[PDB]
Design a protein around this ligand. Structure first.
Ligand code: MG
Ligand code: MG
Ligand code: MG
Ligand code: MG
Ligand code: MG
Ligand code: MG
Ligand code: MG
Ligand code: MG
Ligand code: MG
Ligand code: MG
Ligand code: MG
Ligand code: MG
Ligand code: MG
Ligand code: MG
Ligand code: MG
Ligand code: MG
Ligand code: MG
Ligand code: ZN
Lengths: 260, 185, 143, 49, 66, 49, 47, 143
RNA sequence: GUCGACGUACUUCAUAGGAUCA
RNA sequence: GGCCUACCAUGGUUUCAACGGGUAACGGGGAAUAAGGGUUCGAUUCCGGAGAGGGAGCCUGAGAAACGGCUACCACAUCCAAGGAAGGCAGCAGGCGCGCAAAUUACCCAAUCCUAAUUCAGGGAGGUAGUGACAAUAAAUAACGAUACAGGGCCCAUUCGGGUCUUGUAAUUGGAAUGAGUACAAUGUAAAUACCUUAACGAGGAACAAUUGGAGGGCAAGUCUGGUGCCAGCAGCCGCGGUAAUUCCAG
């Protein structure tokens, strides 16, 4: 309104951060970074809220400035850094590595991974082009730009990136039978396989996913991420595996988990 | 700028102030359970109106509708837990019974009197609101505390009352020191 | 002066209720298109058991074949049929004798005269279709 | 009347009151408009220095 | 007479060098329990120096005695 | 109709109106000399006694 | 003191309110008495 | 059919036909044109100030008679002078002449044994204080 | 000008019928 | 991009309502009544627009036609040695707008977040306390006995029981109970205040003094009105004395 805004009033935050109303008047507004605004998670909503390591939003800064937390191998200090889908948050002390994946309610899970898995991440290509001096590049979903890819890589192929070197290691095409994790819209977090794909020259090509209990559903392609072949996935899925239970079965599960 | 802390009123005025059956009914209720004004009765009739209408609006479903099965089991489970409904009468139909005296019998005041530690209804309200009974080991001093089905075994005299065996309280110590000071020291 | 009645509370009327239908309750139900059983559910918010007496059923059968849809409604299987120990007389008289001899029915009717004569008896609530639904008058357990 | 404001004066530290409050009195009795009464606008009166 | 100090929801947080928890105090036949007595007993249980223990929060429960 | 009133006449002058008289009243010990002392000290910066 | 303190009457300022019972103070007490009174009547007419 | 169209492409006709024949409904033209208050005696207002012009029945022997209780009051907005009741005849001592009475509508629901057709207002506040707070001797009238 | 035609606002007049009893 | 210029063409919208008026018209999420269909409200906690007394310009900057930036003009208005100079609360507090009225010119960055060269400085943004009964939630203002006329339950009324299911009419009194308040203390908090907890005090007219309304009843050695008597009607804070006295519908 003459320039970019800078505050974000809580109640206009993303609904999936689970920020309680009546605790203050504003919400952490993510800086500009790799991931978009509505579909990121700042590090202060992750360190403070989720893991309960901090109590304030000041002790978060005194964690980040001791050079402790690193997103994707590189050590980050901007306390509202937009962490996002498929990142690898390493905390050196506590010996922990997390990856940010969804879960079938739409949130962002606290999903610890092992060490040797914490050294790659997946990136869905978003464009391929000839760069400059005739050098091809790919542009993945987290803003990366990788020169010299394998010429069989086209738009919507999922690439597997080695965090240290930064180079592409591996890739996965986009075809039926591929395992798909859905990051966007109403089915946010469900895992199925592809069954079909509709053409629509002109806009918004749809995709018929089917999960592992035979419940098909349709999403736009924009919201589809490919994470491996049938059976075998490449990342490690969170618990519950993307099934989308239904609430009567959810309560039968909870109640039958009556252990004390 | 903050988010609004919502609220809403728990009672509502009925149709008409006078309708002499209504005045006679409210007198029977507010004299039998030892109540204070008409707002207590109207609050309970507002609760029971909400319960009975949402249960009615379920009955205009069909069996094996997921919405009816889910929220019917929810409502029945809650009304069983409060004690209002029975244990055997657990169909959705039976909550279109449930007159107001069923709620006003689970009230903590009457539940003290029924347990026979209170000698009247009004004496029970006064023991409640003077910090004397303790439902869990939590001293409750609200008289409208809607006792649950399995709190009911744990109502007893509060461990820091003078009846729950602590210390003679205020006037008993004053008289004790007065007697044993006028006689001796 | 029965053992149930308060000054005017009459606390032997309780869910589920038992209503007695007059012959022009049926006519104005058919006219305003409310339905018997669900209409009483939608006002009393409790289960109901509509009852019809042998004097009233005789009166319905006396109307003729222009009013045969109301008769179709009255022979419905879940409207019970209370039988009455009568010569067989005018309907409203049989209703008043039922009310005096037991004081535990509420009376659904629409004629003004029967309304007055019921209102003299203390403790008998009195449903009647008005406007678009079944308004109830003298019942102290409404909401 | 209602809403007529009174002033609350704390201690007498130096033979005189505070400065915040006394400054409020001075501001308030130096903005104030007076009412045209009846007995005073027919009779001359005089206060004797 | 006897406070008992139990410590619940313990998290070891080594990236601010602490052990954070929820102190839960029983004090029957006694009012509100003093905070330096808490830092003394906590710093003894965890075997740490008394000036290394911090403590805050502490609403005492309606009815009294916890 | 909060504005309207019985009309009355003012008869205070317009060129040089006299000083307004500010009585200060109250019971015996209540400190009504410190009030006048500190009001005048604020309004002239010149303490009296 | 030498201080002419104030009255009771011109403190609480309730002039000419009529004199009610000791039972309009406490609604519970008033409904209690009125119930156990209008229950006596129903123990004579329901004889 | 009836007078109105019914085909499924005539909403425009029905909507204009309601939009014209709606200005012929006195409450509609009353509430949109903003005429709605010259019915009400005061203007738009709910109370109105006034000057006590004189008393009526101050020389009327028969005590507590209605003409003893009525004063005659000039309103300050118009200039029109009306008559006004006063509760509790002793409260004629409080109003003098050139007070500011604040009048409210009398709005009486019913008419008694010896009442008056014509008093339509009643005095609520006399020179700032309120007659219930002078008659009850809470406040007193600031001259 | 106690003026006319309107436009608003308000007031008022028209309520008893059958049956039994005296 | 008719956005403007030069040249050329004569088009464009309209009874399916254009154009021009009225709007106590910022739009939406939303609020209310409701059996429904509908009808009304939405300056007002979130989003979008627009404005910073009115009109017109513009600078620096990625970003402004910016007003806690500048420049001129209309309108107000402040200082002056009369030459000049400085202005913009539809930010927070606080004032005038009338002669008739209503929050504090309070404490703080501790929380929520923002900015900067930056962990640290700053933030009337925002929190904290105060303040007209906004709208909402819970609920005190006594509980249990024994005494002082009547009877009602009624074992019984053949005649005395006052015997008693005790319902009280109660007006004395018997001890038990507790917090409104005051307060060591600790907790709370940035610091306090209050809540929650608690030593010591704190209940008989529990004077530790519930209210707002409307209906009736009587008040005579009184007044006033009318009349087919002793009446009726209005009314009755007004009588024969008396006001440290009357101790009155205990009141
Ligand atoms: Mg802005
Ligand atoms: Mg396209
Ligand atoms: Mg002096
Ligand atoms: Mg041109
Ligand atoms: Mg509007
Ligand atoms: Mg406007
Ligand atoms: Mg709006
Ligand atoms: Mg602007
Ligand atoms: Mg202005
Ligand atoms: Mg800049
Ligand atoms: Mg500007
Ligand atoms: Mg400004
Ligand atoms: Mg600004
Ligand atoms: Mg302001
Ligand atoms: Mg700071
Ligand atoms: Mg530098
Ligand atoms: Mg503010
Ligand atoms: Zn029969």
């Amino acid at each position: 309104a003459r320039g970019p805004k800078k505050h974000l009033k809580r109640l206009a935050a993303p609904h999936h951060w689970l920020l309680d109303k009546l605790s203050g008047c504003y919400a952490p507004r993510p800086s500009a970074g790799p991931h978009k605004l509505r579909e990121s998670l700042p590090l202060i909503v992750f360190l403070r809220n989720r893991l309960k390591y901090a109590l304030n939003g000041r002790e978060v800064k005194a964690i980040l400035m001791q050079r402790h937390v690193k997103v994707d191998g590189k050590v980050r200090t901007d306390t509202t850094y937009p962490a996002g889908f498929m990142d690898v948050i390493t905390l050196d002390a506590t010996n922990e590595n997390f990856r940010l994946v969804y879960d079938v309610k739409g949130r962002f899970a606290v999903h610890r991974i092992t060490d040797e898995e914490a050294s790659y991440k997946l990136g869905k290509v978003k464009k391929v082009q000839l760069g400059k001096k005739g050098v091809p590049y790919v542009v993945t979903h987290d803003g990366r730009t990788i020169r010299y890819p394998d010429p069989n890589i086209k738009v919507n192929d999922t690439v597997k990136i080695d965090l240290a070197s930064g180079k592409i290691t591996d890739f996965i095409k986009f075809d039926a039978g591929k395992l798909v994790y859905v990051t966007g819209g109403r089915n946010l977090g469900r895992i199925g396989t592809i069954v079909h794909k509709e053409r629509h020259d002109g806009g918004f090509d749809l995709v018929h996913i089917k999960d592992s209990l035979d419940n098909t559903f349709v999403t736009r392609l924009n919201n589809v991420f490919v994470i491996g072949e049938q059976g075998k996935p490449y990342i490690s899925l969170p618990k519950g595996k993307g099934i989308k239970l239904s609430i009567a079965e959810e309560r039968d599960r909870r109640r039958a988990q009556q252990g004390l | 700028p903050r988010a609004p802390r919502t609220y809403s009123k728990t009672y509502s005025t009925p149709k008409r102030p006078y309708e002499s059956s209504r005045l006679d009914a409210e007198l029977k209720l507010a004299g039998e359970f030892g109540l204070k004004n008409k707002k207590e009765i109207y609050r309970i009739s507002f609760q029971l109106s909400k319960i009975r209408r949402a249960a009615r609006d379920l009955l205009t479903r069909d069996e094996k509708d997921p919405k009816r099965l889910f929220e019917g089991n929810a409502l029945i489970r809650r009304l069983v837990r409060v004690g209002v409904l029975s244990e055997d009468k657990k169909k959705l139909d039976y909550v279109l019974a449930l007159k107001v005296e069923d709620f006003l019998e689970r009230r903590l005041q009457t539940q003290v009197y029924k347990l026979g530690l209170a000698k009247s209804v009004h004496h029970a309200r006064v023991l409640i609101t003077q910090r004397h009974i303790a439902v869990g080991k939590q001293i409750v001093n609200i008289p409208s505390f809607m006792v649950r089905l399995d709190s009911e075994k744990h109502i007893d005299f509060a461990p820091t009352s003078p009846f729950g065996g602590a210390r003679p309280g205020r006037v008993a110590r004053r008289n004790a020191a007065r007697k044993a000071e006028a006689s001796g020291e | 002066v029965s053992s149930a009645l308060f000054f005017q509370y009459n606390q032997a009327i309780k869910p589920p209720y038992q209503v007695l239908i007059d012959t022009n309750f049926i006519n104005f139900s058919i006219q305003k298109k409310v339905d018997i059983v669900r209409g009483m559910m939608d006002c009393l918010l409790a289960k109901c058991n509509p009852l019809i007496t042998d004097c009233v059923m005789a009166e319905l059968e006396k109307l003729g074949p222009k009013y045969r849809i109301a008769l179709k409604l009255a022979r419905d299987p879940r409207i019970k049929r209370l039988s009455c120990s009568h010569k067989g007389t005018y309907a409203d008289d049989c209703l008043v004798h039922r009310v005096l001899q037991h004081k535990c029915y509420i009376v659904a009717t629409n004629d003004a005269g029967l309304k007055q004569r019921i209102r003299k008896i203390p403790g008998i609530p009195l449903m009647s279709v008005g406007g678009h639904a079944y308004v109830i008058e003298k019942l102290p357990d409404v909401f | 009347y209602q809403g007529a404001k009174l002033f609350y004066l704390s201690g007498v530290i130096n033979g005189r009151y505070p400065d915040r409050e006394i400054l409020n009195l001075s501001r308030f009795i130096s903005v104030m408009k007076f009412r045209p009464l009846k007995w005073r606008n027919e009779h001359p009166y005089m206060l004797a220095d | 007479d006897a406070v008992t100090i139990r410590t619940r929801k313990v998290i070891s947080n080594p990236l601010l060098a602490r052990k954070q928890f929820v102190v839960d105090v029983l004090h029957p036949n006694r009012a509100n329990v003093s905070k330096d007595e808490l830092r003394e007993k906590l710093a003894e249980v965890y075997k740490a120096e008394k000036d290394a223990v911090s403590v805050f929060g502490f609403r005492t429960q309606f009815g009294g005695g916890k | 109709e909060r504005k309207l009133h019985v009309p009355m006449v003012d008869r205070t002058p317009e060129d040089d109106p006299p000083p307004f008289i500010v009585a200060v009243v109250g019971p015996p010990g209540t400190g009504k000399t410190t009030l006048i002392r500190s009001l005048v000290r604020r309004m002239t910066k010149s303490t009296l006694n | 003191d030498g201080k002419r303190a104030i009255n009771y009457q011109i403190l609480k300022n309730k002039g000419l309110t009529p004199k009610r019972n000791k039972d309009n103070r406490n609604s519970r007490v008033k409904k209690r008495k009125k119930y156990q009174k209008a229950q006596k009547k129903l123990k004579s007419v329901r004889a | 059919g009836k007078g109105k169209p019914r085909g499924l492409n005539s909403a425009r006709k029905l909507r204009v036909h309601r939009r014209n024949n709606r200005w012929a409904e006195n409450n509609y033209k009353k509430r949109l044109l903003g005429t709605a208050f010259k019915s009400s005696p005061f203007g738009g207002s709910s109370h109105a100030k006034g000057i006590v012009l004189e008393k009526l029945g101050i020389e009327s022997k028969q005590p507590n008679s209605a003409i003893r209780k009525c004063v005659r009051v000039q309103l300050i907005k118009n200039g029109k002078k009306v008559t006004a009741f006063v509760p509790n005849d002793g409260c004629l001592n409080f109003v003098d002449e050139n007070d500011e009475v604040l009048l409210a509508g009398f709005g009486r629901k019913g008419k008694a044994k010896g009442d008056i057709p014509g008093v339509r207002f009643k005095v609520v506040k006399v020179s700032g204080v309120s007659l219930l707070a002078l008659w009850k001797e809470k406040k007193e009238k600031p001259r």
